Amino acid sequence: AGSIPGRRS
Amino acid sequence: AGSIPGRRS
Amino acid sequence: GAMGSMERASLIQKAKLAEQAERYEDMAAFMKGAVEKGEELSCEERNLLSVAYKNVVGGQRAAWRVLSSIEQKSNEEKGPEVREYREKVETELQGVCDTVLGLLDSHLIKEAGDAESRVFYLKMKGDYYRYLAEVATGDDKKRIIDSARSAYQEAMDISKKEMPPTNPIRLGLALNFSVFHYEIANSPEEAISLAKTTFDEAMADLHTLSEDSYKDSTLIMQLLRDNLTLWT
């Protein structure tokens, strides 16, 4: 399913 | 304001 | 060029795949390779070329506006970094605009004889000079603006002679030329007049259209109305 989104600091 | 979006064929 | 070893038809197929994958830089490189094969482009292929570069330059313009806003705020000493990075993005954007203009000049426009192709390419020429004008400041800002105006004007003259007032390319040309007047040329009254006249003349020709053409034309008419609502 979902990993850490991690795309916004 | 807005021009033709033009980003989807 | 760089795509010189790939078949024209494979470049077109890969441009369509790149669109689906939202890989617009790839899409633009595939379509540049297709143009450089030297044959004229079909209606669908012209649309692929325009979508690819519009997405590439649209990302650059959005980034340039973010950076320009930060730079304007800064002018505590932030050092040269914001200006340097805005300049890097600006140069990249200018390079993409010059690439598109170069394709139009070598040799898409000169070989375009039908109104649909010639108006399409001249509208693109106006658009990419307009994107150059958005970032221009030096001794050529005036000349860049005049180049945009001249391209849009030639496209308008052909479109009014050769296309019905509901034709979507004619409508989108008028929309974008009205944005040029409002945002670039400091002519808001000319922008409003062009958008209103374009809208009204299209309205009066809708009765001639099929259901599908009606949908296409009314979609662009709503964009003209949206601008008029913002400007008045």
Added chain:
Amino acid sequence: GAMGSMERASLIQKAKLAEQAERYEDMAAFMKGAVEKGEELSCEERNLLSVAYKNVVGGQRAAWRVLSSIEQKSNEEKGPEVREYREKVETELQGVCDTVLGLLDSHLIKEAGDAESRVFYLKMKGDYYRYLAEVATGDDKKRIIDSARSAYQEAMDISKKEMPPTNPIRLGLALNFSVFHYEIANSPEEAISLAKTTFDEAMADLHTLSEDSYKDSTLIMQLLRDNLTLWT
């Protein structure tokens, strides 16, 4: 390297500007240049490195999945183009993963002595091997999977010894290792067990936290719960 003439602090500043401008390829190049200065990274700088590459590889993974789906559908003869273009995207994705892994191996992990830095980098190592595993098919798919597992396991062992069960890095490590178990290693029961145990042990430690830390930890706990809802 390519950023060798730019000051470390200017690279960091430009990475932050590139994030604001949504220029993630630039952001990743600036952060690669900062790592290659050879100094250890602060907590904030580690986050910039991870955000930059996560966005770059996230776009590549999304494109690879679109292309892989089209390729699977095709297998009328569509010619070699879908496979060729999927392969091009795959090779680019692999190159980005190899670049990140190379930074971790030269020399971020070996110099990372505190638990927060070492766990962070080992989690990244597991993640980028996991992205390699997503596209792997040949005689190294097993070895790539084992490399991901080994990195995540070392990070888990340190995190359980050195960090409280609510620590956000510990929680995100467990979340991503549970995704590895479910999606890569064909171990859905191990995925569910790890997500449940992680969630329950964090819940029992929330009483120790400030309002702001509580918000940070409960956000990741909700991601564990979202996966558990999808998997059960």
